[PDB]
Design a protein around this ligand. Structure first.
Ligand SMILES: Nc1nc2c(ncn2[C@@H]2O[C@H](COP(=O)(O)OP(=O)(O)O)[C@@H](O)[C@H]2O)c(=O)[nH]1
Ligand SMILES: [Mg+2]
Length: 164
């Protein structure tokens, strides 16, 4: 029993970091990276079952080539990510949603405001974020990959939603 999920959003919102935190338990400050993967994975327990979650980073690519389309193909859940400190990343969300729906249909999706550890100097107000989440009909999480807040919860919610 495997579940494929795509992580979707503008550059530098924390997508690859989110995947690395969830699958490996690590957060790297320096970002000095070397090797390419198409997905990471990890086992999760849901409704007394051993689910294999495979997380693909769609890397902010707006026009989908054959590789990008393969990233989206067979996606069973979607994480839409914006950054606390990047207003354009928040504004791009409704467009990203349309691209995801056009590509794969109406799969379980969550909206994530990442970098919430930096909330004291946020580019976006909670009321705006909740307002967008309501408009798009999406459960909203405020997340810190850096501090491991509301990362596991997002993927668990989506996995449960798919297996309901
Ligand atoms: N303060 C803070 N920084 C973060 C968080 N998540 C990611 N970052 C940083 O934001 C930068 C971009 O992250 P990255 O995962 O590469 O973004 P991506 O382009 O969406 O894959 C990196 O320097 C990360 O360390 C977070 O929760 N809090
Ligand atoms: Mg990336």
């Amino acid at each position: 029993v495997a579940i494929k999920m795509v992580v979707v959003g503008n550059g530098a919102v924390g997508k690859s970091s989110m995947i690395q935190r969830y699958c490996k338990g690590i957060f790297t400050k320096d970002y000095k990276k070397t090797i390419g993967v198409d997905f990471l994975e990890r086992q999760i327990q849901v409704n007394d079952e051993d689910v294999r979650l495979m997380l693909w980073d769609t890397a902010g690519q707006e026009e989908f080539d054959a590789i990008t389309k393969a990233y989206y193909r067979g996606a069973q859940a979607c994480v839409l990510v914006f950054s606390t400190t990047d207003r354009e990343s928040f504004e791009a969300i409704s467009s990203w949603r349309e691209k995801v729906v056009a590509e794969v249909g109406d799969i379980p999706t969550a909206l994530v405001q990442n970098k919430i550890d930096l909330l004291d100097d946020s580019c976006i107000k909670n009321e705006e974020a909740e307002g967008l989440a309501k408009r798009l009909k999406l459960r909203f999480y405020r997340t810190s990959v850096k501090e491991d807040l509301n990362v596991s919860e997002v993927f668990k919610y989506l996995a449960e939603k798919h297996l309901q």
